[PDB]
Assembly symmetry: C3
């Protein structure tokens, strides 16, 4: 049902360049408290790397488990991750 991927980004000055929604305090989809990518910004690290996709659920940020955290905590994890940011993500597998 899902595919998983490790994606490490080099933040640089352009920034990670994606928007997120979700968290235990405000689920973005049903009761799923996941941190979801809602938008990817042209020129940002995510866009240049090419692997991250809209709707991807971020499960881990470097060593921080963000599978079940508040939106605030997800933001803090992303902010403190530094210049080298390892994302472990989950996405829906397409119907074939």
């Amino acid at each position: 049902e899902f595919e998983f991927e490790e994606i490490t980004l080099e933040r640089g000055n352009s920034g990670l360049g994606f928007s997120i929604a979700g968290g235990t305090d405000n689920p973005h989809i049903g009761d799923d408290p996941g941190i979801f990518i809602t938008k990817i910004i042209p020129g940002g690290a995510a866009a240049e790397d090419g692997r991250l996709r809209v709707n991807d659920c971020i499960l881990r940020v470097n060593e921080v488990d963000v599978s079940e955290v508040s939106h605030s905590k997800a933001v803090e994890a992303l902010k403190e991750a530094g210049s080298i940011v390892r994302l472990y993500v989950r996405r829906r597998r397409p119907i074939l």
Copy 2:
């Protein structure tokens, strides 16, 4: 408020090539248990045909009514539909 469309796809080896979310067991939007297209994969049948759109709600798969089913049942309907897959879909009409 809505537009409806019949779209029949020829699966071939590329596959239908779209992701879905939703169902009675896990509504993708509010209490709407609809089966929604969340992504369309380049090279797939859906993309090549061109008619199916992200956010389209699949109401019927061949002769199977998927208006109110579990996600599992929607998947099973799509899997068993064979090579010729008739989708009856609903989408929001745009504000003009």
Copy 3:
């Protein structure tokens, strides 16, 4: 966390050309009753203007506060706005 923007569209004959979802009667995201842009139609005023983005939350339509209204009321506000339609919108700021 958010960015705000004023966007005024000239409706013309092409129409505003965007789809919306949400409202107090049927929240599109969690308990957020916001009116959200779900799609932007090529050739429409929104697309030609270029500023409006999918996921943008419409807070105001000319002088009508649509921050907390039914979907029906949001539609009525957009319909009665005439040819010159001032939208005040909110969107998520991206992670940098």
